[PDB]
Amino acid sequence: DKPLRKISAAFKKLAIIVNSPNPEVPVTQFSHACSLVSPLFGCLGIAFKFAEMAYVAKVDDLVRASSSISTLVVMMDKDIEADCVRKAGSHTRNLLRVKRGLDMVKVLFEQIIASEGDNSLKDPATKSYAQVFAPHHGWAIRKAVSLGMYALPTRAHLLNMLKEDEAAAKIHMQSYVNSSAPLITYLDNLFLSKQLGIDW
């Protein structure tokens, strides 16, 4: 019942698996881990419940994909063979949006850690969003998100919703930051090594 701990435990397993040469990452286990992140977006206010749904929709596709597909590589190789990589709703396309979700949380976590003593979430939330999603979300979406900033809870309140004190929240947020880093790099390299790009 400790959402940050579930997140930290799940991504630590992925970081371990992935710090192997030639890793075999199960879609099942990957999408499960990703869904553990979902509630964080809920904790960022009622406007951002919509950001949660947008994230949850992508993760849910990875979940359905995992019923008939073993690894993230196999998933991308299928889409590559059907030439449907960037088609709206393809597993690989959703995979890329989900990777950004993870990065989003990671940078948010960094920004929150680097802004201790500030009880407001506005600066960490806008900086992390500008960095991760500004190059990809259109003007329309970004305007909405910018409006969403006005419903942000306090820092202390967020922590209360995650049921952590300052010290514990810091350890589990830092853990996710540590674990998610090589995973994101691994996911980026999956797209780069197949010349798909990460910008679409």
Among 62, 145, 190, 196, binds ligand 1PZ (CB under 6 A): 145
Q: Binding to ligand 1PZ by residue 91, rule CB under 6 A?
A: no
Measured CA to CA in angstroms, residue 197 lies from 3, 55, 85, 189, 193 at distances of: 32, 21, 11, 9, 9
Q: Binding to ligand 1PZ by residue 134, rule CB under 6 A?
A: no
The pair phi, psi for residue 164, each rounded to 5°, is: -130, 150
The window from 7-15, 42-50, 62-70, 171-179 that contacts ligand 1PZ (CB under 6 A) reads: 42-50
Q: Binding to ligand 1PZ by residue 101, rule CB under 6 A?
A: yes
Rg from Cα positions in the chain: 17
Q: Binding to ligand 1PZ by residue 107, rule CB under 6 A?
A: no
Q: Binding to ligand 1PZ by residue 55, rule CB under 6 A?
A: yes
Min. distance of Cβ 187 from ligand 1PZ in angstroms? Answer: 14
d(CA 176, CA 189): 20
Q: Binding to ligand 1PZ by residue 147, rule CB under 6 A?
A: yes
The window from 10-18, 28-36, 98-106, 182-190 that contacts ligand 1PZ (CB under 6 A) reads: 98-106
Kindly report the CA angle at 37 between 190 and 178, in degrees rounded to 5? 65
d(CA 188, CA 196): 10
Q: Binding to ligand 1PZ by residue 148, rule CB under 6 A?
A: yes
Query: How many residues belong to the chain?
Result: 200
Kindly report the CA angle at 114 between 172 and 187, in degrees rounded to 5? 60
Among 9, 17, 47, 73, binds ligand 1PZ (CB under 6 A): 47
177: closest CA among 30, 37, 42? 37
Q: Which residues bind ligand 1PZ (CB under 6 A)?
A: 41, 44, 47-48, 50-51, 54-55, 58, 88, 93, 97, 100-101, 104, 125, 129, 133, 141, 144-145, 147-148
